[PDB]
Write a protein that binds this DNA or RNA. Structure first.
Ligand SMILES: O=c1ccn([C@@H]2O[C@H](COP(=O)(O)NP(=O)(O)OP(=O)(O)O)[C@@H](O)[C@H]2O)c(=O)[nH]1
Ligand SMILES: [Mg+2]
Ligand SMILES: [Mg+2]
Ligand code: NA
Length: 327
DNA sequence: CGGCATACG
DNA sequence: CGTA
DNA sequence: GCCG
C-alpha cells in the first residue's frame, strides 16, 4: 500500500465503509477544532481502507498500512470488537460537533464563522434567521435555500442542467464546450452540487466568457443567486420539478484550452485526491501542480499537457480514471 | 522536528 | 472571510 | 496524527 492516495486506485464503493465513515467523523471533528494535521491523517487513514481489496476483520491486517498509528488503530480495534467506538459516538452526540456541522453546511459559512457563532451562543438555523443583519448576502442565500440545498442532487438532475448551461454557453460563445466535472464525473449517483468546466478550442476565445454566460442564464430566469471579470462562479439554479422546482448549487469554471487538462484534473477530485496529488508532485517530484499547470521551478518551465494521461505520465504515476480517484 | 494543496470571489 |  |  503506497503512502499517497494518488498512487493507488480508490473506487467509489468499497469493502470497509463503516470503518472509513468512523475515521471521517474524527477527521471532520478535527477540522472543526482547527487541527488540519489531524484532519489529514484521519482522512488519509480512511482512504487507505477504501483502497483495500476486502474487509478488515482483524487488527493484525492494519500492520504496515500507512497512516495507521496508535489512535486510528484503536478506533478500528473498537469497531471490530464492539461495533462502536466510544470516541466516535461521543463526537457524534456532542453539541459542538452537531452545531458546527449544521452551520458549516450553510453556503457562505465556514469553520471560522461557525465557531464564532457557536461561541456567541447560537445553535439553530432560526437563531441565525432572527439576526439577519449579521449575515452576508451569500449567507442569506444559503440560509433561504438551505432546505433545498440539503436535498441530494440526482444524476437525473444533471442532464437537464447541462442542457440549459450548454444553451447559454452556445449563445455566449459558439463552439464553447461544457464538461461535467466533480463527483458526478467520478461516478457518484448523487451530489451536493453540479460542477462544470467550460472552454473553447481556440486559445484566447474563452476570455470574458463567464459574465456573458451568467447574464444569459439570469435573463432566462434560471439563477436564484450568484456572486454578481471572473472565471469561477458559485451559483444557485432553479431546477424544474413536477409542478414546481427546487434550488440546486451549480459551479461553473472557465479555462483556456491550453490549461484544460489541468483544470479538468483539478475539478474532478476527489478533494483528498487533489491534495495528495499536489503533495506528491511537490515533495516527491519537485514540481508545483495547480489547476492551471505543472511548473518545474529549476528550469522555470511549464509542462504542456494535452490530456490528463499526460499529467500522470509527467509525474511518474500510473493513470487513474476518474472512477478510481475517490480517495 | 517540519509539514500537511492550491487557487479564485 | 468565503468558495472550488 | 502520522510520515519521513
Ligand atoms: O477544497 C476543495 C474543494 C474542492 N476541490 C475540487 O473541486 C471539485 C468539486 O468540488 P465539490 O465541492 O463540488 N465536491 P465533489 O467532489 O463534486 O462532491 P459533492 O460534495 O457531491 O459536490 C473536487 O472534486 C475537487 O477536485 C478541491 O480541489 N478542493
Ligand atoms: Mg460537486
Ligand atoms: Mg462544486
Ligand atoms: Na459552508
Amino acid at each position: 500500500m503506497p503512502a499517497y492516495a494518488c498512487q493507488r486506485p480508490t473506487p467509489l464503493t468499497h469493502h470497509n465503509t463503516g470503518l472509513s465513515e468512523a475515521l471521517e467523523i474524527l477527521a471532520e471533528a478535527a477540522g472543526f477544532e482547527g487541527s488540519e494535521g489531524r484532519l489529514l491523517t484521519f482522512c488519509r487513514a480512511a482512504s487507505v481502507l477504501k483502497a483495500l481489496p476486502s474487509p478488515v476483520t482483524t487488527l493484525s491486517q492494519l500492520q504496515g498500512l500507512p497512516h495507521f498509528g496508535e489512535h486510528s488503530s484503536r478506533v478500528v480495534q473498537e469497531l471490530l470488537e464492539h461495533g462502536v467506538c466510544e470516541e466516535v459516538e461521543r463526537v457524534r452526540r456532542s453539541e459542538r460537533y452537531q452545531t458546527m456541522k449544521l452551520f458549516t453546511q450553510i453556503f457562505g459559512v465556514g469553520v471560522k464563522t461557525a465557531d464564532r457563532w457557536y461561541r456567541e451562543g447560537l445553535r439553530t438555523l432560526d437563531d441565525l434567521r432572527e439576526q439577519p443583519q449579521k449575515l452576508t448576502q451569500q449567507q442569506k442565500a444559503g440560509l433561504q435555500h438551505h432546505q433545498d440545498l440539503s436535498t441530494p442532487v440526482l444524476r437525473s438532475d444533471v442532464d437537464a442542467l447541462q442542457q440549459v448551461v450548454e444553451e447559454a454557453v452556445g449563445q455566449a460563445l459558439p463552439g464553447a464546450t461544457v464538461t461535467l466535472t466533480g463527483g458526478f464525473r467520478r461516478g457518484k449517483l448523487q451530489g451536493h452540487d453540479v460542477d462544470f468546466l467550460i472552454t473553447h478550442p481556440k486559445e484566447g476565445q474563452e476570455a470574458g466568457l463567464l459574465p456573458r454566460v451568467m447574464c444569459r442564464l439570469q435573463d432566462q430566469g434560471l439563477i436564484l443567486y450568484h456572486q454578481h471579470a471572473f472565471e469561477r462562479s458559485f451559483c444557485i439554479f432553479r431546477l424544474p420539478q413536477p409542478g414546481s422546482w427546487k434550488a440546486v448549487r451549480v459551479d461553473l469554471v472557465v479555462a483556456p484550452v491550453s490549461q484544460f487538462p489541468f483544470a479538468l484534473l483539478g475539478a474532478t477530485g476527489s478533494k483528498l485526491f487533489q491534495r495528495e496529488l499536489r503533495r506528491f508532485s511537490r515533495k516527491e517530484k519537485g514540481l508545483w501542480l495547480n489547476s492551471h499547470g505543472l511548473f518545474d521551478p529549476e528550469q522555470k518551465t511549464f509542462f504542456q499537457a494535452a490530456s490528463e494521461e499526460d499529467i500522470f505520465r509527467h509525474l511518474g504515476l500510473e493513470y487513474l480514471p476518474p472512477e478510481q480517484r475517490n480517495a
